Design an enzyme around this catalytic site. Sequence first.
Site, short mmCIF file in Angstrom:
data_model
loop_
_atom_site.label_atom_id
_atom_site.label_comp_id
_atom_site.label_asym_id
_atom_site.label_seq_id
_atom_site.Cartn_x
_atom_site.Cartn_y
_atom_site.Cartn_z
N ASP D 69 34.46 -52.86 -19.22
CA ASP D 69 34.53 -51.38 -19.31
C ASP D 69 33.24 -50.91 -19.98
OD1 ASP D 69 34.95 -51.47 -22.16
OD2 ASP D 69 37.12 -51.39 -21.90
N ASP D 132 48.98 -49.13 -28.30
CA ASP D 132 49.73 -48.35 -27.27
C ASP D 132 49.89 -49.18 -25.99
OD1 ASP D 132 47.14 -48.28 -26.29
OD2 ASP D 132 47.03 -46.09 -26.13
N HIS D 134 47.40 -50.50 -24.21
CA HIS D 134 46.27 -50.39 -23.26
C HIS D 134 45.54 -51.73 -23.19
CE1 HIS D 134 43.61 -49.51 -26.86
NE2 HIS D 134 42.71 -50.15 -26.10
#
Lengths: 240, 240, 241, 242
Positions: D69, D132, D134
């Site tokens: 990313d 969370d 991710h």
Amino acid sequence: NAMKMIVTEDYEEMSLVASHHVLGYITAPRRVNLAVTAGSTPKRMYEHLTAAVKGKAFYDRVHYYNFDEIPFRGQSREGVTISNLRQLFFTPAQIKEENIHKLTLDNAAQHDRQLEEAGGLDLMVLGLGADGHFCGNLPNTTRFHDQTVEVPIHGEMIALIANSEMGGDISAVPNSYVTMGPRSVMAAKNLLLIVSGAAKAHALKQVVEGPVSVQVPASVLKLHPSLVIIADKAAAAELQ
Amino acid sequence: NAMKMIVTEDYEEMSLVASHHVLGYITAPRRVNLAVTAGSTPKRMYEHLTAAVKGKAFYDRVHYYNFDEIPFRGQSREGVTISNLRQLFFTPAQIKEENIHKLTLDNAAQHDRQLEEAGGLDLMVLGLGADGHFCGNLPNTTRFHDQTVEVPIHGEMIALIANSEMGGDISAVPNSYVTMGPRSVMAAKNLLLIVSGAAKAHALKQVVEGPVSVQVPASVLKLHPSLVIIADKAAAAELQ
Amino acid sequence: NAMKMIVTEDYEEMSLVASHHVLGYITAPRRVNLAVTAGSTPKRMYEHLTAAVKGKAFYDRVHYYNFDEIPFRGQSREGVTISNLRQLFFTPAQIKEENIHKLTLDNAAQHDRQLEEAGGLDLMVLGLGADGHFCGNLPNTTRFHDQTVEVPIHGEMIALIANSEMGGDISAVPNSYVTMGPRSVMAAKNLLLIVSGAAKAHALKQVVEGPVSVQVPASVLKLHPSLVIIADKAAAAELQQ
Amino acid sequence: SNAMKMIVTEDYEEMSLVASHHVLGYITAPRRVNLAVTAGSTPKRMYEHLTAAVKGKAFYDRVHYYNFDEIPFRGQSREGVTISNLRQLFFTPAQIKEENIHKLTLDNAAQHDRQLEEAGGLDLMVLGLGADGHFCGNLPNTTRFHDQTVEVPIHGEMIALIANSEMGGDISAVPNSYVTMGPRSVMAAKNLLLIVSGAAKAHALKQVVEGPVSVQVPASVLKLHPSLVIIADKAAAAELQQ
Ligand SMILES: [Cl-]
């Protein structure tokens, strides 16, 4: 491999090419575990595999497994899936019984553990339903985290099973069936999806180009790192 | 021992089973490098491979290599090995030229380095001589540490090559030939030795049960960790 | 892989790098079969492997095997090889007994079959003798086609074994020993040859650049398709730079 | 392939050491290997161990590294936060050759998936798990499982989430969008190594290991991968059924 899409001219070529892909595992020198589908799609493929292994004793480390099973209500006979696999391939190909591993409602809770102890599935040869189902993972009722599970049969499912998979009558439809869930299928090291006919063109498009959804169960297979799809022109007609 | 010995009924079965083993590599989804033998032993095998890949564009990551070559004296045409491989398989199977890698005297010194850069050989399909030779590794003159090397042609070798390769024409026998040596052959990830006929029974016994010796070059192949031998009953007659 | 030659600065680096290569197999999620050498060359390597696996229960599918064994003459105790492997690694690393497979004269005839049934050796970690021996495959007496075999001990071999293995005690040298032969070694899927010291420089040159010969047994290992050699500068000193 | 393997370590130090040993299994492979590696605080110690294992060594030259990313700095032409953190945590101190570092950016995202397949595909992806759930830039609800390498617009609450998880809480440099390998691209890796540390990740880890597959908890889809190894410390594994 990035998903490999093989488009053949017709059912005969699809069947031949699929047999060559499976022969790559059958000819492996060490033990290989193959889960194989029943149904009409693989009939010709199994005829080619029969001619390739019938009367040969040197493929004795190849172990075969059914990935779903529907028992006959009130009967003690073998279920519809293993019965069709014997008729389509194990009987004519003379596969040794010790190399045939049957999944039933009785041993389902131990099936996932037995596969991992045997080294896991090397390949699963599966078909695609017109509605995008795979194995016994049907639309909306499918849960992607499911491993080998029992599925209750209710309502409209009774006539559908009686007329299609069973091809007999209402009285033989049991209370439930067993299927390897999406997680169990995805745990195979390699997947081989065989698809033939115009009736499967829409489902194949949803799998290759559509979003991952329980409405079209096979849509999750495009997430597998080692998937090969062999479709004929009629089944690949909606691909862009 | 990992070595797998497959004994078939006759030349036809040997040829079919050998084609199925090679199809396991041809159907692999990523790039595979296959070194393939010429001669009469693989003729039927190549007929089966031709029928399996002719007119198919989805085996485009399969790269083919010759493991030896004998040029025609005073001629600039392709050597006897690649010429026989084209007639036996590359031409009728319609293999793309970009997937055919030719070994010649001119590029021999760079052949071993080019193979390692391409990921190494996945499989070598070789034949066994009645005297136990493999590739151009002949009795007594073979050196096991040799990689790809040039071998001078002198004395009795001239008539033997002229009669077995150039239809008894001694004027077309060159000064030397090139062959992948035993070390280069052994560097392949997997070996497939195909053997047919009573004339090969003694050599096969020396390979499977005999000592490792330069007098019977193929005797060193039993040291490979991933060897499959496909022989017919006539070739396996001296095995115990 | 085309034979990979790794040259480290010294014994400490050789030992660390060798431990990292072996950890690639120890951390594999499915069953792996590792044949491991005794001797002084791997001592530091085993100290690194001990620190990496001691008190860890998640490497329970790693199975260890000795590739040779010399029993103590007239004694019923375990042989010198498994005894040294326990002292160098299995004991301090707390390896479970069910993951330790012993080769002895008594089970040698079944050893090759048991390995193939277990899926074959994934890796063999071997040392190189100053004379080019590997395992119990000694100069001239080695036969490349040999699998797991018993080797009679006679003549000069008696004093050599007594002094190098049994602290100069000739009464403890037995009539024979067992070793995985060159064919059994070559049957492993991968080989890791560790070499340290000036005393091994000549043997290493013969292995990497010399012809295949029974006079220098390890010379046959260069024919393996998946060999990694980890040597220190002193052991690599005779290799053509 | 392996049924998901769950490794529970005593603490962050053991998690970091064991994770380095798993990655060294790929770094020591003799042929080319393609490794996609995570940034963040979870792998800091792991990278210190990998630095000590490869610094000053020329024999791991067929190991190629990839970021999965990238978040550029708004209005700045410098390298993004991910490759910048990977250089600081590992490529610089480990002396990795630039020819073995493959950068994913907004500019080359459309060609990233094709370049990986041409290079032989990813051998391993070392990823972290967010509180969370991710993974990479696949955040709750906005994640689409069929996505390959895609550009994702940054709006609303996503500003603080990206600033805190990628840019050390600095909201001022948050750009208009970022790029991430989507779940399909991640799942295409041959092997996955999920590293998890700390009490803040215990709930997400339970949802991944024992919960249903859902876009609400993106990493929940990783349990479908045939070759996944999870290395968590006791604090992160606290909600798993004993
Ligand atoms: Cl069907």
